[PDB]
C-alpha cells in the first residue's frame, strides 16, 4: 500500500478566499427570495441592498484569479450559519443563502472547472452551532431527546444562551456556541462521512479540515480518507494542523496539512526583527525569534525530513491565513520581507498558498474587523508583479514544484539552496541582511551551472572549472534571485 | 370572476393521518444515515430500533386506506422539527428525517398518485421554532442580526429557553417556542409564498392552513391563492378555522375550511347528553348542549346558508381532528352516536373527513398520550363496516356529494332531509331518540319516491297518492337510514 497523494495538488497554486468579504456581484441578484417580483424588490431592503461578498462575485472575478496564475481556490466555511459566524454550522447540506446558496455555488464550481481550477471547501466537523437541528432537538427536548448521546452533555438543565448559568454540555474551547459532537458515537461518524461524500459527489475537489486534531476517535480520519477517496481518488484532504502533523501523515489519513511549520521560520528569517509581534498569531505559528541563515536552514531541513516525501509534495505551504494577520501587515509594512517570503514560499516543495489580498499588499489585522479587503486598486503593483512573476516561474520550471531541496550556503544572513529535478537544477538565494552580501559556495552537488537570472537581479555570478565547480554569489541587501539554464 | 373550487375535492373522501403514530414500515429502513453499512447498523441504536411512524408505513398500508374508500389523505405537519413538536417547524424545505425525509415522502406521493389518491400537507406559517434558521440568526446575533425585523421582537435581551426572564419577542399564544413571524414584512410574505410553491411543484395536491386567522396582513391569503393556483389550478386550499369563516370564503382566498361548525351541532344532536364533556374540545367546537331535531335543523340550515355554494361543496367536513378527542371516545363509548354522526357526515354537502382510527372505533383522549393507535385488529368490525358501507354509497350516489340539502321533518328527536341532484333524490332520516319513532311527512318537494333501503333498515316506508305525495316513516331507536330508487 505505497503512499499516494493527488498529483494535481503537486503542481497547483492555491488561493485562500474569504467569500463573505472577497467580492459581491454586479447585476441584480435574487439573493434569498429567488422567486421574487423585481417590482417588490425595493420592498425587500435586506436583499435589495445586501453588502458582503457572495459566490457570484468570486465567479465573476475568475478572470483576475486565473490571471494571477492560481489554479485552485479554497475557502473558509460557506455552509449555512448565522451571519459572521461561518464556523457555527447550522446546516451542512446548504451553502449559506447570503452567499448565494447551492444554486450560486453550483455556478461557481462549473465556472471554475471549465477554466480548469479546483475548489476545496472547509469542513468543520468537531462542532456545530446551537441551531444545528439535532442539537436543537436536544435543546427542545432536554433529557427526553433522541440524540442527547450525540453530543457531550454534562448534566441538566442547559443554558445555551444565558451565561450566568452552566450549560451542562461541552463547547469547543469552553464556548456554548460551538456544541461539540460525540465523535466516538458511530452514528455521528456516519452522518459526518455522508456530508463529506455528499459534497464530493456534488463535484468539489477536496476537503480542508478545521481543527482535525480535536477529533480523536480512533479510526476516524482513516475512514474519512477511504470514504472520500472512494468517491474521488483525486480528492485533496488537508488538515489545518499547526505543528507536528506526523500523527495524521502516515499516508492513511490526510494528504497533508497547512504547513505553519514552514510559515513561522520563513518569517522569522525573512522578516526577522521586523515582525510586528502584535499580529502574531501566537497560537498558530512561531514567526519569532528572528533566525539567521544557518538557523533557518537547520529548521527548514527539520521540517523537510519530517513527513514522507509524497506527502511533502502535497503539503499546503502558506504565510498567512484567515486565522492570522496578513503578510504585508505582519511585516510592519516592509516590502522586502514580503518579497523574500513569497520567494521562499513559491520555491518550496509542496503546494503554495496565497491569502487573498497578499498578492496586492492589502493589510490585515489579527482581530477584529481591522480586516477588510474586497481585494480596488488599491493594490501594490510592485508586490503584485512579484507574485505573478514568481508564479509563472514556478509553473515554468518543474524542479520548483517537485524537485529536491538541498541547502548550499547558509551563513550570516545569506541563504542558498537548490531545487533539482532530473537535469533541471535551479539555485535560489536570499539576502536577509541589510548589507550587500557575497558568498563563495562549493557547488559540487550540481551537475550543471545555473547562470541566468530568471528573477532577482543579483551579481557575482562567477563560476569556474568543471572538475570541481566553485561559485561566488553577490546579492544586494534584502534581495533574492533565481538562477537557471 | 365567478367563484371556482377544485372539482375533485367535491367528490373526495378525506382521511386525516398523524404520520408519527400511524404506521412504521417493515423491511429495514436506512432512516437517517441513508448511506450506512448494514454491518454497522447494530452499532446505531436510534436508527436500528426506531419506534414511531414514518411515511414508509403509510405508503405500505395504502391498500387498507384505499379499501376503506378514501381517495385523499392529509396529515399534520411533517417538515423538519424536533421530536413530538411537529408544529415547531425547523426547516420547511425538508420532510423530517425520522419520517423518512423528502426521499420517503417522494415515494409515498408517487405511490398514492398511481392509485389516484391525493395528498395535502399542513402548512404552519404563522410561526416556526427557535431552530428555524433566521430566528437562530437573530438569537445568535441579537440586535446586530439582519432579520430582527422578520419577527415580533419586543426588546433585548431575549431569553428563548430560560423562562424566569422575559423573552422580548412575541410567541404564539405567549409561548417562547413558537416565534411568530412578521407577516406584514413583505420579505416574509415572499419566503412563505415560495414554500407553498415549492411543495406544489414537488407535486403535492394542496395545502391545509394551520391557524390561518392569526395572519392578518391584508392581501396575504389572496396572494397565497394566486401564487398557489398559478402552479396548480386544481390545488386545494383549506384553512383550519373553527367558527364563522366568511372572512376567508369570498372566493378569493381559501377553497373552504375544516367545518367545525358542522361538527359541533352534529354531535350535539347525534350524541346529545352522551357527550363526555371532558374531551371537549371547547376551544375547537361546541358539541353541546344537546340539540333536538328542530334545533339541529335550524343550526344546520344556518351553516349551509353561510358560504357561497361552490365553497360549500369544497368544505372539509369532520367530526374529529388531531386537536380533538376521537369520536368513539367523545361519545362515552356509545356506538349509536358514532354510527349516526358518521351517517350525517357522509351525507352532508362538502368533502367528508375521517380521522384515522375512527373507522375502527379506536379511542382518543384529548391530551396527552392518552392517544395512541397505529390504527391491530384491534378494531370495531361493526363501526368499520358502517364506515366502508356509507363511503361506497356516497361514491355510488352523486346527490350525496353535490346534491342540494332540504329538511323535510324535524320534530322531537327525528330528523329527515333530502339530497337531490337532477332526478336523483335520496331521503336520510335520523332517530336520535331512545324510542322507536315514526313521522308522517308531506314530501311534496320531491318528484320521485325513495322506497328502497340503501342502508339503515327502517320501517314505515308507506307512501301513497301522486297528486300530492305523503310519507310515513318509522325508525328504530337510535338509528338512521338512506332511502333511494
What b-and-e string marks burial along A61-96, b requiring 16 or more CB atoms within 10 Å of the CB? Answer: bbeebeebbbbbbbbbbbbbbbbebbbbbbbbebbb
For residues A26 and A7, what is the distance between their CA atoms, to the nearest angstrom? 36
Contact residues, chain A, for B43 at CB < 8 Å: 186-187
For residues B40 and A271, what is the distance between their CA atoms, to the nearest angstrom? 53
Residue B107's domain spans which residues?
Answer: 1-396
CATH number at A357 reads 3.20.20.80
Q: Which residues contact B426 (CB under 8 A, 6 or more apart)?
A: B347, B397, B399, B400, B403, B418, B419, B420, B450, B454, B482, B483, B484
Q: Do B335 and B194 sit in the same domain of this protein? A: yes
Q: Do B284 and B421 sit in the same domain of this protein? A: no
Are B447 and B418 in contact by the 8 Å Cβ rule? The answer is: no
CATH number at B477 reads 2.60.40.1180
Would residue A210 show up in a list of annotated catalytic residues for this protein? yes
Q: Do B330 and B438 sit in the same domain of this protein? A: no
Given A371, A396, A421, which residue is the final one in a domain? A396
Would residue B240 show up in a list of annotated catalytic residues for this protein? yes
Q: Which of A35, A44, A133 lies nearest to residue B187, judging by beta carbons?
A: A44
For residues A253 and A220, what is the distance between their CA atoms, to the nearest angstrom? 9
Contact residues, chain A, for B144 at CB < 8 Å: 83
Given A361, A396, A431, which residue is the final one in a domain? A396
A205 is written with which cell numbers? Answer: 475537489
For residues A257 and A248, what is the distance between their CA atoms, to the nearest angstrom? 9
- Is the CB of residue A103 less than 8 Å away from at least one CB of chain B? no
Q: Which of B34, B47, B158 lies nearest to residue A187, judging by beta carbons?
A: B47
Contact residues, chain B, for A47 at CB < 8 Å: 187
Q: Do B303 and B448 sit in the same domain of this protein? A: no
Contact A137 B34 (CB under 8 A): no
For residues B168 and B116, what is the distance between their CA atoms, to the nearest angstrom? 48
Task: Please give the full DSSP string across B43-69, using - where no structure is assigned.
Answer: G-HHHHT--S--HHHHHHTHHHHHHHT
Q: Calculate the alpha carbon distances from A259 to A148, A242, A357 in Å.
A: 37, 7, 19
Q: Do A300 and A178 sit in the same domain of this protein? A: yes
Query: In terms of Cα–Cα distance, which of B135, B131, B173, B162 is closest to B151?
Result: B135
Task: Please give the full DSSP string across A281-348, using - where no structure is assigned.
Answer: -TTT----S---HHHHHHHHHHHHTSS-HHHHTT-EE-S--TTS--HHHHTTT-HHHHHHHHHHHTTS
How long, in residues, is chain B? Answer: 485
Given A344, A376, A396, which residue is the final one in a domain? A396
- Is the CB of residue A91 less than 8 Å away from at least one CB of chain B? yes
The catalytically annotated residue of A122, A205, A210, A339 is A210
Contact residues, chain A, for B88 at CB < 8 Å: 140
- Is the CB of residue B160 less than 8 Å away from at least one CB of chain A? yes
Counting Cβ atoms within 10 Å, is residue B308 exposed (0-12), middle (13-18) or buried (19+)?
middle
Which residue, among B184, B190, B191, would best test binding to A if mutated, counting the most A CBs under 10 Å from its CB? B190
Q: Do B392 and B402 sit in the same domain of this protein? A: no
Q: Technique behind this structure? A: X-ray
The B437-441 sheet, strands edge to edge: B437-441, B471-475, B459-462
B466 is written with which cell numbers? Answer: 301522486
Q: Do A224 and A294 sit in the same domain of this protein? A: yes
Are A55 and A108 in contact by the 8 Å Cβ rule? The answer is: yes
Residue labelled with grid coordinates 376503506: B68
Residue labelled with grid coordinates 555570478: A461
Contact B88 A43 (CB under 8 A): no
A129–chain B nearest CA distance, Å: 9
Q: Calculate the alpha carbon distances from B415 to B409, B412, B427, B443, B485 in Å.
A: 6, 8, 10, 14, 20
SS3 A433: coil
> Into how many domains does chain B fold?
2
- Is the CB of residue B42 less than 8 Å away from at least one CB of chain A? no
Are B440 and B423 in contact by the 8 Å Cβ rule? The answer is: no
Contact residues, chain B, for A98 at CB < 8 Å: 146
Q: Do B314 and B421 sit in the same domain of this protein? A: no
Cα Rg, chain A, nearest whole Å: 24
Longest CA–CA span in chain B (Å) reads 84
Q: Outline where DSSP puts E strands in B200-304.
A: 206-210, 236-240, 256-259
Handedness of CA A185, A189, A190, A195 (dihedral sign): positive
What b-and-e string marks burial along A190-203, b requiring 16 or more CB atoms within 10 Å of the CB? Answer: bbbbbbbbebbeee
Q: Do A407 and A341 sit in the same domain of this protein? A: no
Q: Calculate the alpha carbon distances from B343 to A319, B307, B432 in Å.
A: 80, 23, 12
User: B404 φ, ψ to 5°?
Assistant: -85, 170
A424–chain B nearest CA distance, Å: 48
Q: Do B275 and B241 sit in the same domain of this protein? A: yes
Residue labelled with grid coordinates 501587515: A329
Q: Do B167 and B316 sit in the same domain of this protein? A: yes
B79 is written with which cell numbers? Answer: 417538515
Q: Angle at CA A330, nearest 5°, toward A325 and A335?
A: 130
Instruction: Please give the residue of chain A at the shortest CA–CA distance from B89.
Output: A133
What percent of the residues of chain B are helix, what percent strand, and what percent coil, each to the nearest 5? 35, 20, 45
Q: Do B438 and B383 sit in the same domain of this protein? A: no
Q: Outline where DSSP puts E strands in B129-235.
A: 206-210
Are A130 and A136 in contact by the 8 Å Cβ rule? The answer is: yes
Q: Which residues pair with B426 in a beta bridge?
A: B419
For residues A61 and A56, what is the distance between their CA atoms, to the nearest angstrom? 9
- How do beta strands B118-123 and B14-17 pair? unpaired
Contact residues, chain B, for A51 at CB < 8 Å: none
A104–chain B nearest CA distance, Å: 18
Amino acid at each position: 500500500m505505497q503512499i499516494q497523494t493527488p498529483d494535481w495538488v503537486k503542481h497547483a497554486v492555491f488561493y485562500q478566499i474569504f467569500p463573505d468579504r472577497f467580492a459581491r456581484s454586479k447585476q441584480p441578484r435574487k439573493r434569498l427570495l429567488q422567486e421574487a417580483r423585481w417590482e417588490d424588490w425595493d420592498s425587500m431592503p435586506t436583499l435589495q441592498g445586501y453588502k458582503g461578498g457572495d459566490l457570484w462575485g468570486i465567479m465573476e472575478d475568475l478572470d483576475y484569479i486565473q490571471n494571477l496564475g492560481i489554479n485552485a481556490i479554497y475557502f473558509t466555511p460557506i455552509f449555512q450559519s448565522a451571519s459572521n459566524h461561518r464556523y457555527h454550522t447550522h446546516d451542512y447540506y446548504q451553502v449559506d443563502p447570503m452567499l448565494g446558496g447551492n444554486e450560486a455555488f453550483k455556478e461557481l464550481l462549473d465556472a471554475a472547472h471549465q477554466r480548469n481550477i479546483k475548489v476545496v471547501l472547509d469542513g468543520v466537523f468537531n462542532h456545530s452551532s446551537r441551531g444545528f437541528f439535532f442539537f436543537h432537538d436536544v435543546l427542545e427536548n432536554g433529557p427526553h431527546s433522541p440524540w442527547v448521546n450525540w453530543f457531550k452533555i454534562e448534566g441538566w438543565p442547559l443554558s445555551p444562551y444565558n451565561g450566568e448559568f452552566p450549560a451542562n454540555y461541552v463547547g469547543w474551547a469552553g464556548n456554548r456556541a460551538l456544541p461539540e459532537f460525540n465523535h466516538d458515537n458511530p452514528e455521528v461518524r456516519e452522518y459526518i462521512m455522508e456530508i463529506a461524500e455528499y459534497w464530493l459527489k456534488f463535484g468539489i475537489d477536496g476537503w480542508r479540515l478545521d481543527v482535525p486534531f480535536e477529533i480523536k476517535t480512533p479510526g476516524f480520519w482513516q475512514e474519512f480518507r477511504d470514504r472520500t477517496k472512494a468517491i474521488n481518488p483525486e480528492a485533496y484532504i488537508v488538515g489545518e494542523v499547526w505543528g507536528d502533523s506526523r500523527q495524521w501523515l502516515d499516508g492513511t489519513q490526510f494528504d497533508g496539512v497547512m504547513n505553519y511549520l514552514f510559515a513561522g521560520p520563513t518569517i522569522a528569517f525573512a522578516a526577522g526583527d521586523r515582525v510586528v509581534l502584535e499580529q502574531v498569531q501566537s497560537r498558530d505559528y512561531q514567526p519569532y525569534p528572528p533566525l539567521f541563515a544557518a538557523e533557518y536552514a537547520t529548521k527548514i531541513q527539520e521540517v523537510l525530513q519530517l513527513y514522507p516525501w509524497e506527502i511533502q509534495l502535497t503539503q499546503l505551504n502558506l504565510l498567512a491565513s484567515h486565522d492570522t494577520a496578513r503578510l504585508m501587515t505582519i511585516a510592519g509594512g516592509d516590502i522586502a520581507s514580503v518579497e523574500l517570503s513569497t520567494l521562499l514560499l513559491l520555491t518550496f516543495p509542496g503546494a503554495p498558498s496565497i491569502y487573498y489580498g497578499d498578492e496586492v499588499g492589502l493589510p490585515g489585522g489579527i482581530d477584529p474587523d481591522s480586516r477588510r479587503g474586497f481585494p480596488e486598486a488599491n493594490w501594490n503593483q510592485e508586490i503584485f508583479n512579484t507574485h505573478r512573476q514568481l508564479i509563472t516561474i514556478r509553473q515554468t520550471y518543474p524542479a520548483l514544484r517537485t524537485g529536491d531541496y538541498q541547502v548550499l550556503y547558509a551563513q550570516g544572513q545569506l541563504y542558498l539552496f537548490a531545487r533539482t529535478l532530473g537535469t533541471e537544477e535551479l539555485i535560489i538565494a536570499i539576502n536577509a541582511g541589510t548589507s550587500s552580501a557575497t558568498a563563495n559556495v562549493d557547488v559540487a552537488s550540481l551537475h550543471t551551472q545555473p547562470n541566468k537570472l530568471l528573477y532577482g537581479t543579483a551579481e557575482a555570478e562567477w563560476n569556474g572549472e568543471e572538475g570541481t565547480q566553485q561559485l561566488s554569489l553577490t546579492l544586494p541587501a534584502r534581495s533574492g534571485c533565481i538562477l537557471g539554464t
